[PDB]
Amino acid sequence: GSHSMRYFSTSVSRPGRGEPRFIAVGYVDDTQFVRFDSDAASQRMEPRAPWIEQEGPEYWDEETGKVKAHSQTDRENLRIALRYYNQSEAGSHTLQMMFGCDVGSDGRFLRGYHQYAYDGKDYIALKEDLRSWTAADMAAQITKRKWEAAHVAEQQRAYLEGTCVDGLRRYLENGKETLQRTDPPKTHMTHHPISDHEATLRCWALGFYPAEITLTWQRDGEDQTQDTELVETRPAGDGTFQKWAAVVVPSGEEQRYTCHVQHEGLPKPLTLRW
């Protein structure tokens, strides 16, 4: 199916304790494969998946260089943000960046990203057409003008349609066994009595990949939306994910409810009944 490669970087200033910490991670779909931590002793891009260890010296030198340069860039970008908003140098601030691309089953471009966030809020994001920017406020509008003049959108466009797609294609092959697989969820259902009159039915989804899934409840066939409790899909640690959905059923009516599971590891949606 369709795949993605994402890079997430986080810069956090620490006034009085030196330079801001820069941490970056790389993802292919839901599998992390690299990391960079400015505080680490290695000062190198490090492997975080087996299928990336095969890359030669050139790769690890170039990636390191590129991420370290992104480290310094965000470093200056935090100081600029400070100036724009005229904020105190006593306050800690955050700067996040995400970039990457989406491909299809044939491995050709489908979508691209290049966006920033300051203190948790959108700052500037490259639009879908990869030619224009959306500046969140008047501080970002100053960056937007400068980037339009410097043809920044053209540079990232080329990376997102060229290098990003190619690197992703290269990874999907090298990690064929890992990244190109789907683990169907193991599904079952648990029952938990609160009182004499009610009872909780819980629907489980275990050991699935990728993380995208959908758990729904139905009674007699209708959809139990505003009464279903849902948790965030969560990693198991082994590379698979977990999730559950629960509804509070009147005692003696447990057989009215069915659990519905949608995962791309499942040819067709499943239907669990208690």
């Binding site: 890079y7 260089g65 590129k66 860039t73 970008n77 970039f99 700052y123 290098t163």
Partner: peptide
Amino acid sequence: LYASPQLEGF
């Protein structure tokens, strides 16, 4: 593959 360096900060 990481995006090549860019300057022209904010």
